[PDB]
Amino acid sequence: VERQVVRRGSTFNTRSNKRKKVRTPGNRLVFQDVKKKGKGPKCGQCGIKLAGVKEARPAAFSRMRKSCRKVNRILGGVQCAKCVQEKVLDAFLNAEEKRMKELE
Amino acid sequence: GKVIRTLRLQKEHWKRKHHKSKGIVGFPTLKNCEATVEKIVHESGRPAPLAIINYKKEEKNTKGLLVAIEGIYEGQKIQIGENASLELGNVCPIKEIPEGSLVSMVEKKPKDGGKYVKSPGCYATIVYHNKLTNQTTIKLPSGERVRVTGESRALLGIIAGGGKDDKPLLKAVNAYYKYKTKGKPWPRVRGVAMNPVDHPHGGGNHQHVGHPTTVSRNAPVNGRVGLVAARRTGRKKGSRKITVN
Amino acid sequence: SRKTKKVGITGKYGSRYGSSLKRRAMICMNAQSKRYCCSFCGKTTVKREVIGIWSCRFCGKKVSGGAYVPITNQQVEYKQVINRMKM
Amino acid sequence: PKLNRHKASRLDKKIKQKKLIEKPLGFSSLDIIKYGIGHEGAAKLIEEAGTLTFVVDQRADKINVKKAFEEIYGEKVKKVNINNTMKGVKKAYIRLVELGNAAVVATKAGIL
Amino acid sequence: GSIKTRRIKVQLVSALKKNRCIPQWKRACPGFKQQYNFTKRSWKRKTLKAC
RNA sequence: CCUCGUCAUUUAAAUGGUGACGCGCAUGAAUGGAAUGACGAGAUUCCCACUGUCCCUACAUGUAGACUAGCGAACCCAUUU
RNA sequence: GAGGAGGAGAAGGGUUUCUUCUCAUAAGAAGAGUGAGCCGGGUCUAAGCGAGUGUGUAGAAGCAUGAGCGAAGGAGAAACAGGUUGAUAUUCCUGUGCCUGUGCUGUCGUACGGCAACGUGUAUUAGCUUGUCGACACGAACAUCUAGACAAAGCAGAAACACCUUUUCUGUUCAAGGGGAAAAAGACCACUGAGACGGAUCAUCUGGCGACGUGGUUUUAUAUCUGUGACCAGGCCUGAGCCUGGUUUGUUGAGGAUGGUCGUCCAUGAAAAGACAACUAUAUGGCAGCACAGUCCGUACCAACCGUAUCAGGACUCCAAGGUGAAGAGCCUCUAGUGGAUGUUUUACACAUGUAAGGGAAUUCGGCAAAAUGGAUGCGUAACUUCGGGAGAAGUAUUGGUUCAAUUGUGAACUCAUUGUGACAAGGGGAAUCUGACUGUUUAGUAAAAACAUAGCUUCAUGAAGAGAGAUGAAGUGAGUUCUGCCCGGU
RNA sequence: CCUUGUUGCUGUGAAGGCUGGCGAAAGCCAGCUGGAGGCGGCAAGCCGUAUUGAUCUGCAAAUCAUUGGCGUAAGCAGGGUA
């Protein structure tokens, strides 16, 4: 079985130095570089990952279409559907108590 | 001879580092506030947990650190200064709190930010209010009684993390982790096991001190080792304390 | 469970360290690992994150507590005194 | 601020003053180019890849070399690569926008 | 090795041009009295201290 | 110290080992005293197995060594021995 | 012998690399050789250092604040195949691309859908504020993918043939970019309304703060296709060009990658540059073609490094085939790489090793050295103990080849001239005493210990803090069990 | 002190869990599941007990052979800083 050399950079096996083995049209087995995985947004209240948005690294994320980075609601990314339902209710119910305390 | 271990470890390059610190711990300065508890966190060198608070100063949001009392939670609203209610975790002027109550983080003079009771499991007791002089007597966890003016502030509860000294550290590595952030030498080599160039207890054909271990308060610094200015020694019973409020 | 007569959770240590010391450690070690009841949601899902900080695995609430138990003896008493002050 | 500058790539440092009289033509096309190189190594590059090779002044850069060629010899340039050699000479390689013209310019200039 | 600074490279370039014998025509000149160039070096016998 | 202390056991035979005894030249209590478990490349005595350690030495193998080509030093030295 | 005497990088060296000539040879002389927007430096900040200014000094040192600096292995926009030289190549040549900006010409835009979970639409600058990304310990088990390795069939070429053999060997390829599933694992939305009870994992567990069920919404790989043909094998001719193949299935599987769980801690495991969303104003903005731009420095070679040298020493990392076996152990082979002071059968004494009648420690300060035991399976296991251990205690038996049953428990028969963990690999065991509790540490170069450390125990001083008595420092004894008597005359 | 790299094969089988039996209770006994430990035998490595072996004009101003101790961790190591 054919064995590999490091084509570029350092041999020292840090997080930035992941590699995989690949077979070429010329029938050689060579190392090729790998980019790191990305984490997408977590909710600002509960720590849950937001639905409807992609996971990518900051530079690659910025080059995608805007639709990959939001949902069409009051808080776009930012917060999940349950947390917005709570926020909408809370603001309403507080105003009604103040209404009563003003009228009485 | 040469300089002893006790002096070398007091030089500046040996002082504790602050790079992992969260901030300076202490009360806000304002006459009244409403605060929210944002997070409860561990800080690398300290066994009692800290609470991050958020309060408005002018229009702007500002952040502070308190030591956590037991029974707060993330999201709780707390009331600071004059006109706060007697509820667990509020901060109040000392003259408002009834006798026999338990308090933490007491200011020694107004607006100092809180000193006194700050270690896990500790509290102070309010023992007397004097309506003429506007003084209050507090009993500290050493047993000492001290007088503070009624305008000083204090936190209502016991400091979190009590009970920690119940579980013995059975192994050498467990002690290692505890002393890694402190200033004391660990492991500690005994002075009688050194040569006379290194320590006043060194040398001789048997391991012994050879001279009395009780030393004067006014002795020169590079030989002030042993029991410094001891009033008595040994395992026998002492005498009655004298007490005034 | 409970395959040993006396040694309990301290069986991990074999014949090392003293007998008397192990039976003090045991009290704390059994207390640390248990799940406890949540005040906010009623479920038995509370566990320790770090000394002094306790946390619920369902609803996410964090609360200050003791080193090896969520509520200490001094707290159970003092909490009552405050409720009387409010009267 | 003063520092030993041992890791730096540019050996100059100081900003330069004005002067009462200034040198006539300045750093200019006929200071930039030294000579074209014609040997068995260079000949292949003219015949196969439409590129000439030249020695250039140490103070020169890619933009300056591009201008100077279009001024002295007259053909239009696609690319310039540069190489500092072990013998203390900066070499430049110039590829022309049309091949074939390389053999015309080389022969007129007497390089080949 | 392959990685070098600009300052180290110029030291090597200069150390390499100086390392040459007396040219063979000079020996014929009436006034010339040198036998061998005593400043010649070998990589096996001395260090440059370019570091 | 006297000292290879006296009595018992282990051997054919014990300046050794273990068990007893005690006016202990000069034992002894966090200058820490006493009785055990688990763990020591720690110090010491005995038994079983095992053997060229020994009685008592013999034969055989590889590599150097002797002789031969090429290459080729040093310590030391009043020297007549 | 793939934890290589193989193929490559870093630190260190500096032309030792390639061609020609000459011996002068680990020797010289003369030439030639290192090409980048996408690889690394120049950027950000760690622990930390610091010009100037203030205070101080005869001048200094020191102390307060602080521009600038601080990682070729931490963070950090964008490239891959195939060819070419005597010597360079993700840098040159051909092909297909991508990032950041600039300009021309066309062509469209100023909004909607779903009960909802959310979708359709490549969208401008600017600003508050709130949040996210960058951005993170160790250990264990379980899934899924990819390299790799096997076995059948097909074809092409090889090896072997006194005999036998469809026996044996080598091949059967597909990059970045573009398009794209089923699957598995989790979140969530609508209807529904469940218990002394249902659901679910290898393991924990889970439900009126909404179970099972029936329909959906979304996040995370990979296979497959295109990449316009290159590349490989074979045949025919040849100082050149033609022709034919590159087809199918099963088993296994990382020392690489990823996912959601679980455990541990008086230990809770970096920052910043640079980004993004929501909200508010404001709008000539999106896409396709064509064109232009992207500076400066490093790039050869190492078996050539440090030890006065062509020195059995020292010296940071990466990739890794088949058999035997639990096993990148030892032993044997494939790919790739390798070697000289000459002849002589060569006494004695040596240094590395073999074997030995009868006896079995008589040897010696002393069993020092050697021998003996050895893997797996079963039977059987004492005193004492802190009840965990002692414990593989001790003591005993079995083991190869073949042909069968039975399906993980294993049985049975036949066979051999010394018997079978056959080579290689692979514990000697028991009874007592002194001593230190244990794992750990030490006199680099004559001492590894009973010495040091350690957990635990006791005493002392303080309300001063960027620290606040469950704290901060100073001493002594040495885990646990059981005890710790008397004396304040001297110092 | 800051930033990093480096755990392969096997034995024993704590806490927690599920079944079956015994008991008036409290809680006892089997078999299985689970995988803790400055815990055992080894590999790569790190070290330095014995032969008072070889060498002592050395291969070497501290090396070599066999034999040993630890090896899931108060373990070993590169660079930056004090």
Ligand SMILES: [Zn+2]
């Ligand atoms: Zn949320």
Ligand SMILES: [Zn+2]
């Ligand atoms: Zn809860």
